[PDB]
Amino acid sequence: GAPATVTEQGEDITSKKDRGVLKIVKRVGNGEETPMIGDKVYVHYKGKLSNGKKFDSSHDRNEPFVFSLGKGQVIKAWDIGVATMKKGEICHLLCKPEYAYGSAGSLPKIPSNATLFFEIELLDFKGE
Ligand SMILES: CC[C@H]1CN(CCOc2ccc(OC)c(OC)c2)C(=O)[C@@H]2CCC[C@H]1N2S(=O)(=O)c1cc(Cl)cc(Cl)c1
């Protein structure tokens, strides 16, 4: 399925080239511009664990998730991944634990040493 496909066919978007964050662009976005550091970014997403369980979805809340890019307000994989996206893009991101919740995990839903799969849609980005 989609997690296997990004695992096997995704692009390594890490600066270290350590395959910690792999990406496939699923829906091509608009033009060429990507957000810059400190922009307010608006995303919809869903996340799955490697046991197949959904652990989160903004769609199910009927509101986007909003954060300031490149400030560590989200896991490293998201700061790295969302920075590569165009407005209107949908991508898949496969996030090894070193770019996610590491050995700690995040109670109650994310175990230790968890590889995470996300589908992310970049709705908008704006400077403040
Ligand atoms: C409010 C939901 C949000 C939680 N966060 C932000 C809080 O977790 C952080 C933030 C910054 C961090 O390092 C700079 C960090 O390192 C472990 C975790 C996420 O980064 C990631 C990515 C953005 C969407 C959500 N999570 S998530 O889906 O992995 C998630 C969902 C749920 Cl239901 C619980 C958890 Cl613990 C995480």
Q: How were these coordinates obtained?
A: X-ray
Question: CA triplet 110, 67, 64: central angle to 5 degrees?
Answer: 80
Q: Which residues contact 47 (CB under 8 A, 6 or more apart)?
A: 54, 55, 56, 57, 116, 117, 118
Structurally, how many domains does the chain consist of?
1
Structural domain boundaries, residue 106: 1-128
Closest residue to atom 31 of ligand 1, CA basis: 56
| Residue 122 dihedral angles phi and psi, to the nearest 5° | -85, 105
Residue 27: which CATH number? 3.10.50.40
Given in angstroms, what resolution was this structure solved at?
1.1
- Separation between Cα atoms, residue 21 and residue 117, nearest integer Å: 10
Residue nearest to atom 33 of ligand 1 (CA): 56
| Cα–ligand 1 centroid distance for 16 (angstroms) | 22
Is 69's C-beta closer than 6 angstroms to any atom of ligand 1?
no
**Residue 109 is which amino acid?**
K
| Burial profile 49-74: b = 16 or more Cβ within 10 angstroms, e = fewer | beeeeebbebeeeeebbebbbbeeeb
Local structure of residue 60 (DSSP, 8 states):
G
Which ligand 1 atom sits closest to the C-alpha of 55?
Answer: 33
Which of 121, 56, 57 has the alpha carbon at shortest distance from 89?
121
Taking CA atoms only, the protein residue closest to ligand 1 atom 16 is 75
d(CA 75, ligand 1 centre) in Å? 6
Cβ neighbours of residue 121 under 8 Å, at least 6 residues apart?
27, 43, 44, 45, 88, 89, 90
Q: Which residues are catalytic?
A: 45, 55-56, 75, 101, 118
d(CA 95, CA 3): 10
Rounded Cα gap, residues 94 and 122, in angstroms? 16
What would the two tokens of residue 119 be? 């589908």
User: In angstroms, rounded to a whole number, what is the distance separating the alpha carbons of residues 96 and 10?
Assistant: 13
